[PDB]
């Protein structure tokens, strides 16, 4: 059992989206004392609608800067983010605790995948 790229469960998709956003932020701005995980892991699961808007806004600049320099993963990050957002019908205003556990599972599964290679 590992990351399932076809689970299409909204909390799971949101967790994967959070993981990829964290990876993109780490790549774009290294050396941060508090990663976006430390800053918004709780808020993202509790209120996906309010914060994922802000995080996605910022992430556009983050992949933009990576594209500027001559390294490329950030096209992969942009494609992944777009796919997950398409699989998500709409961002919930609030999520129940079990949905948040599923969010955490999805986040960790996506984290494991990006670690490889």
């Amino acid at each position: 059992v590992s990351l399932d790229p076809a689970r299409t469960d909204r909390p799971y998709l949101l967790g994967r989206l959070f993981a990829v956003l964290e990876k993109a932020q780490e790549d774009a701005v290294p050396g941060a004392n508090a990663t976006i995980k430390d800053r918004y892991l709780a808020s993202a699961s509790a209120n996906p609608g309010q914060v994922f808007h802000m995080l996605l806004k910022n992430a556009s600049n983050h992949t933009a800067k990576l594209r500027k320099d001559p390294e490329r993963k950030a096209i992969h990050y942009e494609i992944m983010m777009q796919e997950i957002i398409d699989n998500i019908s709409d961002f919930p205003v609030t999520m129940s605790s079990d949905e948040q556990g599923l969010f955490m599972i999805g986040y960790y599964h996506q984290r494991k995948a990006l670690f490889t290679k």
Binding site: N33, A34, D38, R39, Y40, A42, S43, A46, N47, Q50, V51, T94, S96, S97, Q100
Partner: protein, 286 residues
């Protein structure tokens, strides 16, 4: 001293701006939040501490207005003070055998300590003085909308102690709520006031403390905290005329017209107070 004669319920609205209203000892020092819904929380203990501080500041420790829970105070010393004032001998971990003596020792410190008279106390230590419930109770304050606390990383221009890498920079952190409007509910019971002697003078002092609670606890972490509304419901009866929840539901907080983004000022909310039931009187202290 004569105790109050009516039952009270009250609602307090206060907000914080770019500050930590109440730190969480477990989660580092992040402001308390509801882990499932993201709403901010402030323990009733924090507000009661601020009331204690305001009373101590304004009454200057005058007679009958001392604060029992006080910084660096040894409580058993106060218990011994009470025992000596009543001229009893404190048996270790036990109240005086005669109920009259126990009532006397409890009543002494219920009389000359404002916060015991108001919030009660648990004094069953090695120098036992009994316990009190206290007429005034407050529930946890809860923000009306979810709060997204922001961690702020800061640097220090100096090093605490000499070391190989230490004259050198160090890293610190601050937690702030960018903005949050909190609602606190409270109750005052006439029976317990009669038990403790909580009088109308104490009640006026309590209202004053609530209105001016935050004006004197400014610090580098608190930011700007302010009291916004104070609705008090006064019943004509000793035991009440309506359920507490029905009165609390009269105070409604909602986003004002044209407020779209996350709240960042008190002007982003509209507060309306409905009509109280027949046997209840509603007043806006603030």
């Amino acid at each position: 001293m004569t105790a109050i004669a009516n039952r009270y319920e009250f609602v307090l609205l206060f907000d914080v701006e770019n500050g930590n209203p109440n730190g969480d000892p477990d989660a580092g020092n992040m402001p308390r939040i509801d882990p499932e819904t993201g709403h901010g929380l402030v323990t009733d203990v924090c507000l009661k501490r601020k009331i204690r501080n305001h009373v101590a500041l304004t009454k200057e420790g005058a007679e009958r207005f001392n604060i029992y829970i006080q910084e660096k105070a040894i409580l058993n010393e106060t218990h011994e003070r009470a025992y000596t004032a009543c001229d009893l001998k404190p048996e270790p971990k036990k109240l005086p055998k005669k109920v009259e003596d126990a009532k006397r020792v409890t009543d002494w410190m219920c009389t000359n300590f404002y916060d015991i008279r108001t919030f009660g106390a648990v004094m069953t230590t090695e120098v036992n003085c009994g316990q009190v419930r206290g007429p005034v109770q407050m529930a946890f304050a809860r923000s009306v909308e979810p709060v997204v606390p922001q961690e702020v990383s800061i640097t220090r221009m100096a090093v605490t102690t000499k070391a190989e890498a230490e004259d050198n920079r160090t890293m610190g952190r601050k937690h702030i709520v960018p903005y949050g409007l909190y609602v606190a509910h409270g109750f005052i019971s006439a029976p317990l006031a009669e038990k403790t002697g909580f009088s109308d003078e104490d009640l006026t002092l309590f209202w004053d403390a609530l209105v001016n609670m935050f004006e004197h606890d400014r610090s580098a972490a608190r930011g700007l905290m302010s009291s916004r509304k104070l609705i008090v419901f006064k019943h004509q009866n000793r035991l009440g005329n309506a359920p507490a929840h029905k009165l609390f539901d009269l105070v409604k907080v909602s986003r004002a017209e044209g407020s779209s983004g996350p709240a960042r000022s008190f002007a982003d909310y509209a507060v309306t107070v409905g009509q109280a039931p027949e046997g209840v009187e509603v007043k806006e202290m603030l």
